[PDB]
Design a binder for these strands. Structure first.
Ligand SMILES: [Zn+2]
Ligand SMILES: [Zn+2]
Ligand SMILES: [Zn+2]
Ligand SMILES: [Zn+2]
Ligand SMILES: [Zn+2]
Ligand SMILES: [Zn+2]
Ligand SMILES: [Zn+2]
Ligand SMILES: [Zn+2]
Ligand SMILES: [Zn+2]
Lengths: 129, 132
DNA sequence: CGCACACTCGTGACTTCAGTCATGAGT
DNA sequence: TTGATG
DNA sequence: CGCACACTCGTGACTTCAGTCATGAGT
DNA sequence: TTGATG
């Protein structure tokens, strides 16, 4: 069940969420579908496994499975920074409501995720011991 | 409960587990107590929050809470590397069965942990999207 | 209102060479 | 050009 | 015996200046 | 000097 690398055994999932700058509801129709392809492209280029992806009008959800060497600020920069660049290039109409050089809110929300709760894991540990 | 920093909001918990080199059963009594003290000191020096810690004779568990800037290999090196150095100095008797310069198995096991299950989070997000 | 994850200004790093990440401060 | 995502 | 998260040899980074982290490879 | 933790 555990993944394996040279110096470690792991199971790492993160739920990442970020919003459109000014909270504009622009991720719809063609722009939303284009973003899904662009994020898939960026994730494949960076060797990041995307478990699920949801694009809502003003925010994006990604559930990622990572190795211990894939640090959070690095994958968030790659996903948000490269997608904003590619999106403005592929969908220049985005510049009509976002002309300030930003597609994204500069903050992000990140959560570690597990199938069992921290409380259940704690109980399992005491039990094993 | 959701923490905040300059560019992010987060809740990051990990379950880290590692074993003694050769699987020797040496973490007992005062040796185990000293290890716990040393690990808490290292965690404090590094701004890592220790949620729980369990020391068994041949392995150690840590449930940690961290910021998005605390990368896994860095905190594992800080915890395992400095504790091995400090444990051998504080308990020289460890050298009787561990004379090769290693207190620890060179591998570590690490898992992300959430307060709620993945399923509960997924169901909550869907409810949020389905609202009004 | 008064911020601040969000708004703005500022710094530096580094890809996407633009627009994020890192980051303090003001509003 | 801001007002809320988990 | 081969294997590898675990044993061993090897490389480089960086604190803990030892003994981990990064890392490939042979058993 | 190893034999299994999550
Ligand atoms: Zn594409
Ligand atoms: Zn940012
Ligand atoms: Zn245990
Ligand atoms: Zn102390
Ligand atoms: Zn190692
Ligand atoms: Zn949502
Ligand atoms: Zn502030
Ligand atoms: Zn307003
Ligand atoms: Zn191998």
């Amino acid at each position: 069940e555990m993944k394996k690398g040279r110096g470690y055994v792991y199971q790492l999932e993160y739920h990442l969420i970020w919003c459109v700058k000014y909270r504009h509801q622009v991720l719809v129709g063609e722009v939303a579908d284009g973003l899904k392809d662009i994020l898939r492209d960026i994730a494949a280029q960076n060797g990041l496994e995307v478990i699920t992806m949801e694009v809502m009008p003003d925010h994006v959800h990604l559930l990622l499975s990572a190795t211990p060497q894939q640090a959070i600020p690095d994958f968030v920069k790659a996903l948000k920074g490269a997608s904003a660049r590619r999106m403005f290039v592929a969908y220049p109409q985005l510049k009509e409501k976002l002309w300030g050089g930003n597609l994204w809110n500069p903050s992000y929300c990140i959560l570690t995720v597990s199938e069992n709760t921290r409380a259940q894991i704690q109980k399992y540990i005491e039990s094993q011991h």
